[PDB]
Amino acid sequence: SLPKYKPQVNSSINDYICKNNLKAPKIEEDYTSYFPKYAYRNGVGRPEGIVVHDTANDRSTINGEISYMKNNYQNAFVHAFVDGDRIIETAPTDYLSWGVGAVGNPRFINVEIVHTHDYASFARSMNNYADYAATQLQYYGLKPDSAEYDGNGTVWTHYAVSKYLGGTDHADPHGYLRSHNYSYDQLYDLINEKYLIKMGKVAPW
Ligand code: NA
Ligand code: NA
Structure with missing residues (x-):
């Protein structure tokens, strides 16, 4: 079978997420007809990555x-x-x-x-x-x-x-x-693990 991911960043919160096998909900759409639809610099459908923001609220x-x-x-x-x-x-x-x-x-x-x-x-x-x-x-x-x-x-x-x-x-x-006693690097490690699970390179929880 596939190898379990070895966390690259210690995270008791990620340990909690994994141990309890938390399941993300479905991605739901709430689109708005009047928002612009503009291309990324390399074209529509050509994002280069993803940004982590928080609402500051x-x-x-x-x-x-x-x-x-x-x-x-x-x-x-x-x-x-x-x-x-x-x-x-x-x-x-x-x-x-x-x-x-x-x-x-x-x-x-x-x-x-x-x-x-x-x-x-x-x-x-x-x-x-x-x-x-x-x-x-x-x-x-x-x-x-x-x-x-x-x-x-x-x-x-x-x-x-x-x-x-x-x-x-x-x-x-x-x-x-x-x-919340977490960090961006703990989040990144979680993104990495989930990506590898989705790509079939490490074991699902
Ligand atoms: Na999409
Ligand atoms: Na880099």
Whole structure:
């Protein structure tokens, strides 16, 4: 059989996710007819990676975030939102979204983490981000490569886009993940494992 993934980053939260065999919900669509449908720089259907954002909002729900975004889409919109219960895709991943400024937008799928308020719901939200991201990497034939420390790859934080590409100055998701005793590198390891499970290279949970 296939080898179990050896975690490359210690994570008691990822251990919890795996041990309890958490299952991500289905990706559901909530598209909006008036959002623009613009190409990535290499074409429609040509994303180069995916960005981790968080809503920076301790009070909102995923429904409130989506309501706000549909009203303010000319200022910002993203591809999807995840929380502890749902994965909602709000724009097709084949077209760009307005989520990470003028340099990153023509390159990357943008996904927002909605804030959660207990341990189990936070863990699920991480599992859900990672499932969605691994799914996109697989579908588009991208392999996980973290850009955090070298400015190159297919998985980016908003912070990394601000640091290496410019066009924006946000610092998500580091502070938010830290507040829940997690980190971007633990998330990345979870994306990597899930990608490898989907690609049939390591054992499913
Ligand atoms: Na898609
Ligand atoms: Na890299």
